[PDB]
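Re: that backbone. Tokens:
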């Protein structure tokens, strides 16, 4: 929009936003005791939140309403109503806050691992706690004028194509179960429960819907025209948004840049009204924000509206309330003149925003969250949940016993482009951290003598650094190589063009494997890279996926490597062979194989051979898993369901297994539980799909713990060609983990039961 020369938004991965959209405002609170609003109902803390917002909006001029439909809302100075910023980031810690540059207070916020790594922990309680800490820190900043009260998080699109520049931001490739679980825990942590009266921070689940590429084949996200079947929309592209609106009761949602089936998401009433509000029960006074600036893109480049004013009117009437951008505040005035919008329509959207702000305590100085301050940031940071999340999520992919490092390992050759990682560890959407502990610093802190060499860049073809790296390996007891990908490889606005290791890293690794020393390789980054040559090289003793491990990443990594902590992470995406992305267009949105070039996408449908499967992870001990059936689903749905708000949450039954530590090392345990059928519902039948996961506390040698994974009705439903969610009679089989240590067949009997009627059109 703010391009100085010709810009082709069909190709260009980044928008040209106005400085107004991008501005860092100084925030404050209305003075409800003494300011111009003191006798208006909005300042009456005993009045209802809607009535309060309505009384406030009645005081605005039309121009003031229109100007306050943008993310950088100017407020209304004459009313003592401050500017308020809707655009705040919280993906894995606060970002876009007005951070102080000196003086101690507000110089930083906790930098958690990227969500891709946190999710690998398979710990729901962990995700909820991170979100609770993020929202506490958000409130502390808000109370000093340095951050807003709603956040553009979580990013929950499925990580479908493995080259997506932003898959690092997500809970992985399993949109239905794993992503939806993250969605619920995160949103309830941000908001302070399930739609509490006193909202803590408003979540903004994103990006709705069909967005999962930046610019593959030079087709920018900004003008991307996704073609998606109703079945896939229901089954893969939206179930996490159902979970956000229905279960978590997200107060906000962000519509995506792309069109789906010809209609830009922010101008898509089928999405924003029919699905979101009518089908999934998104709060009546919840509000939708556009992406920055998806409303502009309705016009340029989608050409769904012929100008900015018509783009603004179309979006507003479709159900987009707030524009992250300048299209609303600078062109809805023309819409009103042209008769395309009413003042009622504009008032509804601003009232929606302000109704949330009332719920958030924006007008109530005695609100329970208005007293959190800098010491709350300091205290919650000191809990070290960022460290805990990385330690829990790190994934052991290959091991022969080299890990954990024996006490006979005194010196290490620490080599590679991640070896001294600081800012690399933070991924993207990060603010300043209290500290950044590199693997190098942590290795020295752990007692090892460290021979450190860069070896090679992430993406070089210079071999300049190889000789010193090999020399160091020769001098040391063990070799720890840290490399892989980072945000120079995968980022917003620019997808990867391949899913191989970048540069000449694999060459250096191969040469290190020929020195005759123990070799541990750490593959870092959010997307996966093809480690087939490492899997197959006997001289690569260990392989760890370490993601983006946050502020304490170095210590998390080395605590695992030294065995101070024992790993239990499992992969949350498939590690595909490199050729996969060349086999078929990555913007084919169809999940299922098509008997042509599309081999099936994600672990659910892929017909090829992953290098490492979704769900892969090893332990420092061995576990002996043992089991500890006909179900009529119409009957199961006939019973009361105390403890469950929605009937589709009721367990059909609970899978129970005994998990015995049959090895010598105390270790936590993780499990993914998958189900298969070859006769229930429509063909083709998937490989399998995830229906449950859990993580169990440390199990000592010789000890056992019960794994209990309920199998909810919703998890057994399949999706028909119309998008309806139906539980079908037939034969099913559960399998515990990628190693399928336990299997359990069961039958569903009786009639088909409808769980969701997918609305037409
Ligand atoms: C799935 O994820 C969840 C959620 O993240 C994991 O559970 C978390 O586990 C972490 C790490 O073990 C716990 O962190 C520790 O929390 C301490 C504070 O908790 C206590 O107070 C709070 C606030 O009132 C209570 O809520 C807690 O009670 C609840 O939780 C406990 C379990 O923790 C249950 O038993 C209860 O029933 C409650 O449900 C507790 O009472 C916090 O002090 C501690 O931080 C110190 O320790 C770490 C590591 O040692 C240091 O890095 C850090 O700097 C702190 O050290 C300071 O203090 C020590 C004093 O001991 C000094 O020696 C130091 O010098 C320094 O000053 C740590 O953050 C977390 O509480 C817990 N969360 C929840 C919600 O339960 C699960 O384990 C995980 N599950 C699996 C299977 O993996
Ligand atoms: C559990 O929580 C506690 C409480 O927060 C954590 O304890 C804090 O740990 C941090 C990090 O170790 C520590 O911060 C250091 O304080 C030192 C002394 O004041 C500083 O010298 C040091 O600064 C260096 O590191 C920064 C990056 O982190 C750099 O930006 C800075 O420029 C300094 O870097 C120099 O040194 C490094 C390595 O020595 C070198 O690579 C550079 O070249 C450069 O020369 C840190 O700020 C806090 O003091 C701790 N706070 C308290 C109260 O103890 C603890 O880490 C958590 N535990 C886990 C496992 O996460
Ligand atoms: C609709 O509103 C926009 C924004 O207020 C108006 O654009 C401004 O016009 C004023 C007065 O001519 C200029 O001085 C400003 O520079 C413009 N601001 C921006 C950001 O462009 C626009 O004139 C209004 N359109 C109509 C038809 O009323
Ligand atoms: C590892 O990385 C850190 C952070 O990039 C480097 O620390 C910097 O070191 C120089 C002096 O050598 C200081 O002037 C900077 O202020 C440091 N930056 C920070 C953020 O602390 C460090 O030099 C690197 N170490 C190696 C061996 O490459
Ligand atoms: C910005 O790009 C658009 C095409 O997307 C073009 O029509 C417009 O003139 C450009 N603006 C400037 C100042 O070059
Ligand atoms: C703009 O980008 C699209 C997508 O890459 C491309 O097909 C088209 O040819 C480009 N148009 C111009 C005028 O360069
Ligand atoms: C996309 O465009 C870029 C920049 O012009 C170019 O370097 C690249 O070759 C193009 N990619 C494809 C697949 O056409
Ligand atoms: C399943 O349950 C329903 C309602 O409880 C019952 O009417 C029906 O006969 C049952 N079907 C079978 C096959 O048991
Ligand atoms: Zn007074
Ligand atoms: Zn006052
Ligand atoms: Zn909670
Ligand atoms: Zn409708
Ligand atoms: Zn389009
Ligand atoms: Zn089009
Ligand atoms: Zn205009
Ligand atoms: Zn940022
Ligand atoms: Zn123990
Ligand atoms: Zn015991």
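Recovered sequence:
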């Amino acid at each position: 929009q703010n391009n100085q020369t010709y810009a082709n938004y069909s190709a260009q991965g980044q928008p040209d936003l106005y400085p107004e959209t991008l501005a860092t405002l100084t925030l404050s609170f209305p003075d409800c005791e003494h300011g111009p609003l003191k006798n208006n109902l909005v300042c009456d803390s005993s009045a209802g939140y809607v009535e309060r917002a309505q009384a406030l909006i009645s005081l605005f001029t039309l121009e003031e309403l229109i100007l306050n439909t943008q993310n950088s809302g100017p407020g209304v100075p004459r009313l003592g109503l401050p500017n308020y910023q809707v655009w705040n980031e919280a993906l894995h810690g606060l970002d876009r806050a007005n951070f102080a540059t000196k003086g101690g207070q507000f110089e930083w916020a906790t930098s958690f691992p990227m969500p891709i790594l946190t999710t690998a922990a398979l710990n729901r309680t962990l995700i909820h706690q991170i979100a609770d800490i993020i929202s506490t820190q958000a409130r502390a900043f808000s109370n000093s004028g340095r951050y807003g009260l709603d956040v553009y998080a979580p990013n929950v699109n499925g990580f479908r194509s493995p080259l997506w520049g932003r898959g690092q931001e997500t809970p992985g490739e399993d949109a239905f179960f794993l992503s939806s679980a993250y969605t619920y825990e995160y949103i309830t942590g941000i908001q302070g429960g399930v739609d509490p009266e006193h909202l803590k921070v408003a979540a903004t689940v994103k990006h709705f819907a069909g967005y999962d590429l930046e610019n593959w084949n030079n087709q920018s996200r900004l003008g991307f025209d996704a073609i998606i079947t109703q079945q896939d929309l229901s089954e893969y592209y939206t179930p996490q948004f159902l979970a956000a609106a229905r279960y978590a009761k997200s107060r906000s949602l962000m519509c995506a840049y792309n069109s789906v089936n010809g209609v830009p998401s922010c101008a898509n009433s089928f999405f924003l009204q029919t699905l979101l509000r009518e089908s999934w029960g998104f709060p009546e006074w919840g509000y939708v924000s556009s992406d920055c600036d998806a409303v502009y893109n309705v016009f340029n480049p989608h050409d769904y509206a012929s100008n900015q004013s018509s783009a603004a009117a179309s979006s507003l009437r479709a159900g987009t309330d707030i524009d992250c951008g300048q299209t609303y505040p600078w062109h809805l005035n023309e819409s009103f003149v042209a008769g395309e919008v009413s003042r009622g329509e504009i008032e509804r959207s601003v009232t929606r925003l302000y109704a949330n702000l009332v719920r958030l305590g924006y007008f109530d100085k005695k609100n329970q969250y208005r007293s959190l301050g800098w010491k709350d940031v300091v205290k919650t940071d000191a809990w070290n949940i960022s460290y805990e999340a990385a330690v829990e999520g790190i994934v052991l992919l290959k091991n022969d016993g080299t890990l954990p490092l024996s006490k006979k390992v005194r010196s290490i050759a620490l080599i590679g482009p991640w070896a001294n990682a600081t800012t690399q560890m933070q991924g993207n959407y990060y603010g300043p951290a209290p500290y950044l502990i590199s693997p190098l610093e942590a290795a020295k802190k752990a007692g090892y003598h460290v021979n450190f060499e860069l070896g090679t860049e992430i993406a070089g073809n210079s071999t300049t650094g190889f000789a010193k790296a090999i020399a160091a390996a020769k001098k040391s007891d063990a070799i720890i190589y840290l490399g892989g990908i980072d945000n120079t490889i995968e980022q917003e606005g620019a997808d990867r063009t391949d899913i191989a290791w970048p540069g000449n890293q694999l060459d250096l690794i191969k040469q290190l494997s020929e020195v005759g020393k123990p070799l541990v390789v750490l593959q870092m980054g959010g997307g996966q890279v093809d480690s087939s040559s490492l899997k197959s090289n006997k001289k690569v003793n260990s392989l760890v996926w370490g993601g983006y491990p946050g502020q304490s990443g170095g210590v998390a990594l080395f605590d695992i490597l030294s065995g101070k902590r024992a790993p239990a992470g499992r992969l949350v995406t498939t590690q595909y062979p490199a050729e996969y992305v060349h086999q078929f267009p990555q913007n084919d949105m169809n999940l299922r194989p098509d008997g042509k070039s599309n081999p099936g996408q994600t672990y659910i449908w892929y017909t090829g051979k992953p290098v490492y499967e979704f769900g892969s992870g090893l332990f420092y001990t061995t576990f002996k898993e043992t089991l500890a059936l006909k179900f009529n689903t119409s009957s199961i749905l006939s019973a009361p369901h105390p403890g469950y708000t929605y009937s589709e949450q009721i367990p059909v039954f609970t899978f129970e297994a005994n998990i015995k530590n049959s090895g010598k090392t105390e270790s936590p345990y993780t499990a993914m539980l998958f189900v298969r059928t070859s006769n229930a519902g429509p063909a083709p039948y998937p490989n399998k799909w995830l229906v449950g996961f859990d993580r169990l506390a440390d199990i000592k040698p010789g000890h056992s713990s019960k794994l209990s994974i309920p199998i909810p009705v919703s998890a057994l439903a399949r999706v028909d060609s119309h998008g309806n969610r139906i539980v079908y009679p037939g034969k099913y089989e559960l399998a515990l983990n990628t190693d399928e240590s336990v299997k359990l067949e069961f039958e569903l009997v009786g009639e088909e039961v409808t769980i969701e009627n997918w609305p037409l059109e």
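The chain has three domains: 21-376, 394-573, 623-756. The domain at 394-573 is CATH 3.40.50.1700 (Rossmann fold).
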